[PDB]
Amino acid sequence: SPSAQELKEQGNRLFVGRKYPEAAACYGRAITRNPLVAVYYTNRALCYLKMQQHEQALADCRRALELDGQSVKAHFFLGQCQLEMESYDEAIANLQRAYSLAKEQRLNFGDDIPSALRIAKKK
Amino acid sequence: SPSAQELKEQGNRLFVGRKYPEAAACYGRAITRNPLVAVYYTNRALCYLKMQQHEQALADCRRALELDGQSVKAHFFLGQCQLEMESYDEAIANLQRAYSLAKEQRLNFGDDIPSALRIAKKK
Ligand SMILES: Cn1ncc2c(NCc3cccnc3)nc(-c3cccc(NC(=S)Nc4cccc(C(F)(F)F)c4)c3)nc21
Ligand SMILES: Cn1ncc2c(NCc3cccnc3)nc(-c3cccc(NC(=S)Nc4cccc(C(F)(F)F)c4)c3)nc21
């Protein structure tokens, strides 16, 4: 009886090892246990992007944003996805919104700018 | 008598293996052989970002853009650098400009969107 969190974990570790189809299956199972969690869709969206399944990534991005319109990563992956699909004007709009939200949330709450948006995040 | 190109190569391979200070030294030597090449500064800028030498990365970004105001990567690394330094409004402006230029250059010349701007570039 794995919990939805527990499943997101297993998927996150799977994703680390570039096991993307298996990681997407885990996030999918987390979504089925609790389908109103933006991050599960955001995480699976990235798996589909790595798998070059762009239509599925886009739909996951759209669902995440319906649950959480303030999501930095969902805007970013949505923009990255629309980049890969060559919807360039939409992609730029969502990328800027991702970076704008990241700044707002950094300055109101203290969040780190998500690492997905940075190429040189200190490790 | 290594050529400026030859030196950029050695630096590019060094960068692959995460040997960033040694790679920055190579790009530096390429710049000294031919200091009017935007890409050498763009490449070294990334090394400094990986080394968390933000002031040096910024200056390299600025020099690249002086040589080539149409540079996608120079705008992007400049924006990424200003992100790490928390100049958020400038960073967003340069990131959008990077993505805008990438689209223009893609649609006029056929360039791939530089991989540095994409998290899921097909390999
Ligand atoms: C949202 N934020 N703020 C801070 C921060 C962060 N700090 C530094 C860092 C950066 C990179 C690697 N290490 C540490 N790292 C990740 C982050 C980025 C990628 C992977 C993971 N790691 C695990 S296990 N799963 C995972 C797998 C695929 C996607 C995702 C996600 F969709 F969430 F990006 C998570 C964590 N994110 C972060
Ligand atoms: C500007 N564009 N368009 C297409 C393209 C590209 N295709 C796919 C790809 C993407 C990633 C890895 N493999 C293949 N890959 C790189 C690119 C990206 C990073 C590294 C390298 N590789 C070498 S050797 N040096 C190098 C080292 C540090 C920085 C840089 C640079 F500043 F140039 F980004 C180059 C090439 N760029 C690219």
Contact B4, B30 (CB under 8 A): yes
Classify residue B86 by its DSSP letter: T
Chain-centroid distance of CA B92 in Å reads 17
The residue type found at A80 is Q
Which one, of B105, B110, B99, B109, lies nearest residue B76 by Cα? B99
Contacts of A118 in chain B (CB under 8 A): 80, 83-84
How far is it between the farthest Cα atoms of chain B? 44
- Within 10 angstroms of residue B59's Cβ, the number of other Cβ atoms is 16
Q: Which long-range contacts (CB under 8 A, 24 or more apart) does A6-9 make?
A: A7/A33, A8/A39, A8/A40, A8/A43
The residue type found at A54 is H
Tokens of residue A113, six digits: 């700018």
- CB nearest A92 (choices: B49, B50, B99): B99
**Method in brief:** X-ray
The residue type found at A66 is E
Q: Which long-range contacts (CB under 8 A, 24 or more apart) does B109-115 make?
A: B113/A83, B114/B72, B114/B73, B114/B76
Atom of ligand 1 nearest to the CA of A45: 32
- CB nearest B120 (choices: A49, A99, A120): A49
**What's the half-sphere exposure (Cβ side, CA atoms, 13 Å) at B28?**
10
**Which resolution in angstroms does this entry have?**
2.3
Q: In whole angstroms, what is the distance from residue A93 CA to residue A91 CA?
A: 5
